[PDB]
Amino acid sequence: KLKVAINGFGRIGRNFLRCWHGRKDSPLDVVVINDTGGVKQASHLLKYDSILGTFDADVKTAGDSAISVDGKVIKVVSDRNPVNLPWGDMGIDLVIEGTGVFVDRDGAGKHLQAGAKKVLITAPGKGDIPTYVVGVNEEGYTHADTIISNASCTTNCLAPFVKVLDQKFGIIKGTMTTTHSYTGDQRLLDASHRDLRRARAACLNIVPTSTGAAKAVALVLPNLKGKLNGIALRVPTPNVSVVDLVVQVSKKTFAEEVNAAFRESADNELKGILSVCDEPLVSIDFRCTDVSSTIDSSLTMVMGDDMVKVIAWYDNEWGYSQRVVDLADIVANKWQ
Amino acid sequence: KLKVAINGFGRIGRNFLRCWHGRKDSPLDVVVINDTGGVKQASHLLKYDSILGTFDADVKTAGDSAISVDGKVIKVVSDRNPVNLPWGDMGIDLVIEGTGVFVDRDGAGKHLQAGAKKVLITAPGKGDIPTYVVGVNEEGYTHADTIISNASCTTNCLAPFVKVLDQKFGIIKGTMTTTHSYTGDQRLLDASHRDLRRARAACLNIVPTSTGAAKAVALVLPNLKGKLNGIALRVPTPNVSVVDLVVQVSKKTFAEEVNAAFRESADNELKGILSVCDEPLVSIDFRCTDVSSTIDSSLTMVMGDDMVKVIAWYDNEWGYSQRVVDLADIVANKWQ
Amino acid sequence: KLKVAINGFGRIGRNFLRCWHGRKDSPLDVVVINDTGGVKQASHLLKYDSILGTFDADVKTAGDSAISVDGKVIKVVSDRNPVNLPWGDMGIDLVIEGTGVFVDRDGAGKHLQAGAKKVLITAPGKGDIPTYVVGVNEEGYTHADTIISNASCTTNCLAPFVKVLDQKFGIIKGTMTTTHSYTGDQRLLDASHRDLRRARAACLNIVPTSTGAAKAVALVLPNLKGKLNGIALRVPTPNVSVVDLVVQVSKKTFAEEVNAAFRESADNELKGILSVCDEPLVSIDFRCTDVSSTIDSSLTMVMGDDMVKVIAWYDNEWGYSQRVVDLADIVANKWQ
Amino acid sequence: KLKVAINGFGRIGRNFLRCWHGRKDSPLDVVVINDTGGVKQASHLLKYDSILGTFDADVKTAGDSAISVDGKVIKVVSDRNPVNLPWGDMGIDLVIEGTGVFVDRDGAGKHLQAGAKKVLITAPGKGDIPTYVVGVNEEGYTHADTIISNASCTTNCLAPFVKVLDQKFGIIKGTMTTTHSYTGDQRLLDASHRDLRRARAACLNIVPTSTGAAKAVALVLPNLKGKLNGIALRVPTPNVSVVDLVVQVSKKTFAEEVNAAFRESADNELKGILSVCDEPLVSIDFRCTDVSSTIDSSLTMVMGDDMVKVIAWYDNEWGYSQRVVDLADIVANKWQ
Ligand SMILES: NC(=O)C1=CN([C@@H]2O[C@H](COP(=O)(O)OP(=O)(O)OC[C@H]3O[C@@H](n4cnc5c(N)ncnc54)[C@H](OP(=O)(O)O)[C@@H]3O)[C@@H](O)[C@H]2O)C=CC1
Ligand SMILES: NC(=O)C1=CN([C@@H]2O[C@H](COP(=O)(O)OP(=O)(O)OC[C@H]3O[C@@H](n4cnc5c(N)ncnc54)[C@H](OP(=O)(O)O)[C@@H]3O)[C@@H](O)[C@H]2O)C=CC1
Ligand SMILES: NC(=O)C1=CN([C@@H]2O[C@H](COP(=O)(O)OP(=O)(O)OC[C@H]3O[C@@H](n4cnc5c(N)ncnc54)[C@H](OP(=O)(O)O)[C@@H]3O)[C@@H](O)[C@H]2O)C=CC1
Ligand SMILES: NC(=O)C1=CN([C@@H]2O[C@H](COP(=O)(O)OP(=O)(O)OC[C@H]3O[C@@H](n4cnc5c(N)ncnc54)[C@H](OP(=O)(O)O)[C@@H]3O)[C@@H](O)[C@H]2O)C=CC1
């Protein structure tokens, strides 16, 4: 059974733990967490969550170097520097890197220095880091990869259906805009930030900001290299986001044919990854959905027979986290 | 001097009054208001505004059938039925219809029955109603028109630059999505509404909803008939919205050429209607801007040489209201 | 087997139904709902809720005048005029008045004229209407009462622990302030309203407003007559509120003792009604709590040995609805 | 001609500068700003503000180490270590400590080591640091104080009217609760924090937290020593807060009399510091008010002739910053 370590017990770190906790017969086993905030803080923020609600499990605090969840305990380490982490001592097989600071080979490699065997970054990698999106190119994964990236939340929402669109209609070019819930990277009130837009009060504005999803899609789907670009619009919601993709395709089509193409994948190769919703819902209704992307069938439009517009919802926190568990499961099941 | 009457003292009704108050040497003269809420309520909500801030003017309450603003008084009527209104008695020349309920010829025509000479609907008209967008087709207006529409806020933001795009590059087809601030039509908490999405808590969700701007553009710009479609995404902000337009054009171009095309119009035929912003701002920064549309130059993108994506900001309340005053001014200056 | 009818399928009406649905061996049978919005709306808003999340039950429309919940079919009617409802024809024993418009005898009386045998107003009754707060004075209820009131959510949170305070320390005089979540009665954006403060944008302000909870407590707790007063502060949160009580007691005490008095009562006389939380929690953590009041023990203070300050949380929608169910249960248990 | 340096260009630092900029014949000369974010950021965030709106002044960068405001050039430096600041070299007379990190003697002392002649902490000082509240005890300030504190926004709103209450009615004991807007110290989304409640999503909860304002009032008002206590409730509003005071007074009185006492003081001893509003207003209406406290007269209540409840509003950012300017003005006026 794969011994897992969670580096950075934040939104994704905690969502990951709770997603894993819900899996039946998991090949993973979370033995340690690195929360630079304290054992008591880890147990408290794990039990009480403003987004997921109160954790339906017995969350207690063990000694002062570990917490308890439904009985099974998990040690709690604390060190802003990976090289010191007791990964080697504990024999950590995989480190879930969710700090948002160690994304390049050197930064993430430190976990390896500490004694870890593998590292899975819960974000896009930097400079030669194999990226994988479950349902798109996960089959290209090999146990030889010591450092891997699960891409971004937007990329995991877009890639699945872009793959279907390209395969069935052939994308020529396109553009995307994601109306995204605010995240920890933004500021509560106008404050310093390298990105002068993200520096503005998050709950008060619609804030345009760059996104890497467009180019990231090209990584997991080589055929899209240089065909897409896009932006993000952060808005006053705490979780759940939506992507608006517009593409010109080679084969003429219409809205209902596109929707059917999505349903076919949803019922087959993309079951559990892509879903198609025919009800008139809103963002709050997609909270805690396990899929990576949900097409709002009713909003699909086709202009001039070859300009397709698709609207897809995604729980950037929970949905993405389920994909982290899936990739971790792959790393385990394909362990040699 | 044109005698004006404001029917429905709501967001637009009040914004209109304050916009007019700020104009220098106005050809209009607001003599009466129809607030089914009371003289005291009119004066209070006119003086104190959660969006515009406290009205910098002496707002008092006269008798009980009129209010006072910086000295000049304005009578206050109250009747949910236009046919009864004392328009004839007062000799009302133009009625600013901002109730949101009298948009067809029959409904708005009642103001005419009451004795009003003209009616200007602060919203899209229904069934054979001449619609005008200042800076696009206002020249087609004639004093013979007894009932006219100033279209919607989104239409006033989109039309101006779509006109420039079509004239300079030739639009083949396109799609639009407006991330719009919530409005009075939505619900504070999940409650009844014909639109099951707009029925959901407005400050808590991203709510997809239909928009008529796409087809409305075709009204003021015949050449666009059947070339555009789009949707709206209402989000948790009280005012200021943004439109994301994607179009395939006939002439190949690039981002900087498109921006320059917009600047040229902004400095000329569209001065005061269209503006181009080169700073990294957010929605809050566009509050109280007088223009109908402001291009976020830095976000303009061109894919595959002919797929143009443009992001434009607009103060749906204040910006639109300034356009209502402009159209009213036209009705006055062109009065025969 | 009380035949129950729900008049007004709003926040409380829907919370009521879901609360009732979760009870085991209920003496109530909800057979009809009067939803002026129609069958599709009732089914949709019952299934999807921005606060409660998606109803974990099979909810769907049944024909054109009913809906089903896990196979249980419930008739749906639509009439704003209570006198025309088919209560007598259907043999309705109890009507749950959750409209907020028929809170007086002449109004609620309309249901009796329509044939209903009794009415329970989900709010303070207006005039000489018997009001009951479960855990405080319900034993005073009599089958002879044809129209009763369950009081407000605020009164239901306050009364319970004030009963404990008065019984063990003796309240001489006091004042309270409730920091209440916004409700449908408030305005989304500055709009007409009897209360010039409730007329202001709800998600943007701290809105002071009157409250009758202080006086209402004297109806269920005769001893407190003329001893308490209070006001309310509506803040930008969708659900869950909190009461701040300051009372001068006859018996000198201290914080630890006061909390002790609350715990013993919560473990006996007020079990299931009053609770005491020793955790450093926030509003969202109290969502969907079945009790009527939860004392935040760490906030209890006592100044000069006799001035006590108590802070208690309460889910104004769900917690109160559980109480409506309980009061309805009492009506059934004492039915003659 | 006091040479002033602003350390920490945050909400208060920027509000300070804008407040100072609006004063006529100021004895202060802001010559330098230490903004760890850099020159472009300082210029940008000073010009664009989500709360104050766009600064009506020509703001722009000047070279690579300064900015200008209407032609007035201000040097900008960037160092997180106060000891390395060029205070002595520049001849800085007074440092405005708005970082929130150097509030103790050893910390603020670092500025003195760097050559500054005096430090004014924009917050409660930690330890034996003289604290002053303009309108309450400023006359006690002496040029000999090298490090002083202007107290918190809450203490500045409370002290003024509590001085009036104590002087005309005699306060025996009391308790207060402040419904405060969120601040940068809180978390955007559930994240690490010393205070497990402040760690919770700020725009989503009512967050209780400790306050030292009650005790701080005793520092500027010796008479109230050990007579008051209190707590704070952080709510989802960006700016403007309100204090709820409940005191037991020695002199029996009534609401109208208490308000009368406040008005006479606001017209004399506390003019420009304390104000009384007789309008039914909401938080947003008190934005950018220069006074430190505004009593909401219609909310004043008196229970049992001696229990008084007072509610006062205060712009925690702007109102308090005007006070920092005034205290700075005093430092200049008493300079030796
Ligand atoms: N939130 C979401 O929906 C998505 C986020 N992501 C990405 O995942 C990453 C994390 O996001 P999110 O979970 O929202 O953020 P969080 O702030 O919740 O989590 C980051 C965690 O890392 C900790 N940390 C920071 N520095 C270090 C360090 N040097 N060493 C060890 N631990 C450290 C932080 O502690 P502390 O705050 O105290 O410094 C925090 O606990 C980011 O790259 C984000 O872009 C990807 C998909 C979705
Ligand atoms: N808000 C904005 O940014 C934009 C809105 N518009 C459009 O303008 C219209 C008004 O919008 P908005 O100003 O936001 O809404 P408001 O609710 O602020 O204004 C509508 C006003 O009409 C009054 N009213 C309702 N029915 C009647 C009636 N039967 N007779 C007389 N008066 C009546 C309302 O009173 P009461 O509420 O008490 O019934 C209210 O005062 C809508 O069509 C909207 O789509 C167009 C562009 C922009
Ligand atoms: N909100 C809460 O936390 C609590 C509220 N209550 C009480 O319950 C009542 C409802 O409150 P709340 O649910 O918050 O308010 P809402 O405004 O959300 O609900 C009122 C409902 O009544 C419907 N309605 C209006 N008129 C009629 C009518 N004539 N006949 C039948 N149905 C009608 C409304 O439909 P439509 O909007 O389409 O007109 C709406 O669905 C009030 O008495 C309130 O004091 C009690 C405890 C708690
Ligand atoms: N907010 C309000 O209403 C009031 C606050 N105050 C007090 O003023 C202070 C600041 O509060 P507030 O503005 O709200 O907080 P913010 O967090 O908004 O501002 C703090 C600022 O200090 C900067 N900073 C951090 N460390 C240093 C350093 N070592 N040297 C120089 N600058 C630094 C920060 O930059 P960075 O974030 O990049 O690290 C940030 O710009 C606190 O003492 C607070 O109690 C007083 C009255 C009112």
**Could you tell me how many residues make up chain D?**
336
> What values do phi and psi take at C66, rounded to 5?
-175, 165
Residue A175: closest CA among B246, B170, B313? B246
Beta bridge partners, A131, equal A149
Residue D56 carries which DSSP code? S
**Could you tell me how many residues make up chain B?**
336
**∠ Cα D37 D38 D39 (to 5°):** 140
Helix axes C11-22, C318-333, angle to 10 degrees: 60
Cα–chain center distance at B35: 20
Query: What does each C-alpha distance from B173 to A172, A308, B257 come to in angstroms?
Result: 16, 11, 20
Give dist(CA B263, CA D291) in Å, integer.
44
> What values do phi and psi take at A26, rounded to 5?
-80, 140
Paired sense of beta strands B28-34 and B72-77, if any: parallel
R_g of chain A computed on alpha carbons: 20
**∠ Cα A62 A67 A72 (to 5°):** 95
Give which of C175, C197, C258, C316 to mutate to test D binding, by max D Cβ within 10 Å. Answer: C175
DSSP D265-284: HHTTTTTTTEEEE-S---GG
Give dist(CA B127, CA C285) in Å, integer.
52
- Show Cβ contacts of residue B101 under 8 Å, excluding neighbours closer than 6 positions: B8, B107
DSSP A314-328: E-TTHHHHHHHHHHH
Give dist(CA B113, CA B95) in Å, integer.
12
* Consecutive H or E run containing A31: strand A28-34
Q: Are D119 and D97 in contact (CB under 8 A)?
A: yes
Q: Where are the domains of chain B?
A: 2-151+317-336, 152-316
* Consecutive H or E run containing A230: strand A228-235
For the Cβ of D158 lying below 6 angstroms from any atom of ligand 4, the answer is no
Structure tokens belonging to residue A315: 């729980």
**Residue D207 burial class via C-beta count within 10 angstroms: exposed 0-12, middle 13-18, buried 19 and up:** buried
Query: What does each C-alpha distance from A319 to A106, A182, A220, A315, D159 come to in angstroms?
Result: 28, 16, 19, 5, 50
User: Which of helix, strand or coil describes residue A274?
Assistant: strand
Structure tokens belonging to residue B150: 């100033």
Q: Are B302 and B308 in contact (CB under 8 A)?
A: yes
| B327 alpha carbon – ligand 2 mean position (Å) | 19
**∠ Cα C78 C84 C85 (to 5°):** 55
Q: Are D161 and D262 in contact (CB under 8 A)?
A: yes
Q: Are D310 and D157 in contact (CB under 8 A)?
A: no
CB contact under 8 A, C190 and B50: yes
**Could you tell me how many residues make up chain A?**
336
Query: What does each C-alpha distance from C178 to A223, C153, C157, D286 come to in angstroms?
Result: 60, 11, 10, 21
Give dist(CA A143, CA B315) in Å, integer.
54
Give dist(CA C36, CA C8) in Å, integer.
8
Residue A167: closest CA among A271, A72, A93, A251? A251
Q: Are C34 and C8 in contact (CB under 8 A)?
A: yes
User: Which of helix, strand or coil describes residue C86?
Assistant: coil
Q: Residue B217 CB: number of other CB atoms within 10 A?
A: 30
Paired sense of beta strands C147-149 and C119-121, if any: parallel
Paired sense of beta strands D94-97 and D72-77, if any: unpaired
Q: Are C286 and C212 in contact (CB under 8 A)?
A: no
Long-range pairs for B52-60 at CB < 8 Å and ≥24 separation?
A: B52/B15, B52/B18, B52/B288, B52/B318, B53/D284, B53/D287, B54/D285, B55/B18, B57/B21
Residue type, A123: A
Which are the catalytic amino acids of B?
Answer: 153
CATH number attached to the domain at D152-316: 3.30.360.10
Query: What does each C-alpha distance from B283 to A136, B315, B334, D184, D227 come to in angstroms?
Result: 36, 9, 36, 20, 47
Experimental method: X-ray
Q: Are B171 and B227 in contact (CB under 8 A)?
A: yes
Q: Which fold has domain C2-151+317-336?
A: Rossmann fold (3.40.50)
Task: Give residue for tokens 């430090």.
Answer: D119
Residue D238 carries which DSSP code? S
Residue nearest to atom 25 of ligand 2 (CA): B99
Question: Where do breaks (C to N over 2.5 Å) occur in chain B, by preceding residue number?
Answer: none
Give dist(CA D176, CA D211) in Å, integer.
10
3-state secondary structure labels for all residues of chain B: CEEEEEECCCHHHHHHHHHHHHCCCCCEEEEEEECCCCHHHHHHHHHCCCCCCCCCCCEEEECCCEEEECCEEEEEECCCCHHHCCHHHHCCCEEEECCCCCCEHHHHHHHHHCCCCEEEECCCCECCCCECCCCCCHHHCCCCCCEEECCCHHHHHHHHHHHHHHHHHCEEEEEEEEEEECCCCCCCCCCCCCCCCCCCCCCCCCEEEECCHHHHHHHHCHHHCCCEEEEEEEECCCCCEEEEEEEEECCCCCHHHHHHHHHHHHCCCCECCEEEECCCCCHHHHCCCCCCEEEEHHHCEEECCCEEEEEEEECCCHHHHHHHHHHHHHHHHCCC
Neighbours of chain C (3+ CB pairs under 8 A): A, B, D
**Residue D159 burial class via C-beta count within 10 angstroms: exposed 0-12, middle 13-18, buried 19 and up:** buried
For the Cβ of B78 lying below 6 angstroms from any atom of ligand 2, the answer is no
Q: Are B124 and B166 in contact (CB under 8 A)?
A: no
Query: What does each C-alpha distance from C20 to A246, C8, C12, C16, C265 come to in angstroms?
Result: 46, 16, 12, 6, 26
Residue C196 C-alpha, separation from nearest chain D C-alpha, in angstroms: 7
Give dist(CA A34, CA C2) in Å, integer.
56
Residue type, C60: K
| D20 alpha carbon – ligand 4 mean position (Å) | 18
Beta bridge partners, C229, equal C175
3-state secondary structure labels for all residues of A157-201: HHHHHHHHHHHHHCEEEEEEEEEEECCCCCCCCCCCCCCCCCCCC
User: Which of helix, strand or coil describes residue C252?
Assistant: coil
Give dist(CA A137, CA A328) in Å, integer.
15
Helix axes C11-22, C39-47, angle to 10 degrees: 60
Task: Give residue for tokens 């205060």.
Answer: D314
DSSP A79-124: -S-GGGSTHHHHT-SEEEE-SSS--BHHHHHHHHHTT-SEEEESS-
Give dist(CA D142, CA D130) in Å, integer.
10
User: Which of helix, strand or coil describes residue A232?
Assistant: strand
Residue type, C280: P
D284 touches chain B (CB under 8 A): yes
Give dist(CA D266, CA D283) in Å, integer.
20
Residue type, B193: H
Q: Residue D244 CB: number of other CB atoms within 10 A?
A: 23
Task: Give residue for tokens 């709902």.
Answer: C33
Q: Residue A139 CB: number of other CB atoms within 10 A?
A: 10
- Show Cβ contacts of residue A284 under 8 Å, excluding neighbours closer than 6 positions: A240, B200, B201, B204, B205, C50, C53
Residue A40 C-alpha, separation from nearest chain C C-alpha, in angstroms: 12
C81 touches chain A (CB under 8 A): no
Residue C107: closest CA among C85, C137, C92, C78? C85
> What values do phi and psi take at C102, rounded to 5?
-115, 65
Give dist(CA D327, CA D96) in Å, integer.
11
* Consecutive H or E run containing C216: helix C213-220
User: Which of helix, strand or coil describes residue A13?
Assistant: helix
- Show Cβ contacts of residue D240 under 8 Å, excluding neighbours closer than 6 positions: C206, D181, D283, D284, D286, D287, D313, D314, D315, D316
Give dist(CA A336, CA C29) in Å, integer.
60
For the Cβ of A38 lying below 6 angstroms from any atom of ligand 1, the answer is no
Residue A287 C-alpha, separation from nearest chain C C-alpha, in angstroms: 8
- Smallest Cβ–Cβ distance between C206 and the set D179, D208, D227 belongs to D179
